[PDB]
Amino acid sequence: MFYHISLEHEILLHPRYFGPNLLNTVKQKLFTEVEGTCTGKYGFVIAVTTIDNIGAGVIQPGRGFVLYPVKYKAIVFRPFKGEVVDAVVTQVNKVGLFTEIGPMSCFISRHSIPSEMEFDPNSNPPCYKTMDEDIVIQQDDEIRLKIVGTRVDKNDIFAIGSLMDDYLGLV
């Protein structure tokens, strides 16, 4: 889930911004460069909470750019494997459920559900219902699930989910 871990970045600031407000430009380029990057080492990064210190800016020999080492506290979403997390289902397929845990898109296989529940076509809330419609999961349903396998694409991060544990159902 949502962590708060201090981490690092290196802002290569171009000599245009060497005026009275270069540190503000360092902060703005940190906000532009960091937020949204789905690094697999440190999960999603959502917002930069604070900037600890803007380090000593080393001038790159022959390049003009100044490398600024920035340490910063940022809200971080890294959903570890074996976790029970509250998704939001966005669409339903024959192969399973495509959900949104937030920043992450998630998958549930057709056998990763309890076997009592079956796909329902020709209804404009297309859904996985039980035979007696005891629990039905259409669009926009706050279902819990268990993320079992997390895998990294270095552009976005997707994990896979199952629902074979107590309570892992609609809320």
Partner: protein, 118 residues
Amino acid sequence: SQLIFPKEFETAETLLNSEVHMLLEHRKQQNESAQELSEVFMKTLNYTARFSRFKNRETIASVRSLLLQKKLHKFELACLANLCPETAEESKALIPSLEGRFEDEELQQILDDIQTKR
């Protein structure tokens, strides 16, 4: 989870999905008072507004305080306080590494404190 998978996140503060919401909305009302926000940040804000089971900051502070006197692992204070199991049983069915750690008696009491604070 039960055993931790990485080596670096254990000495990292864990946040609830309601601390995150109040931190993320703070960033917005900073921003339009001041560029456009990220897609990931905005849609994560929508997700954590969907599951904001504590709409007021002092409620989250009190929940974190209560779970802090309970003395359980810092991973567990956010996979309970925002998962809001209703039955001690529900809660432990959820945290495979919480069963055996804590006796049954305090489980209903703390859990009912969470469902009280919502």
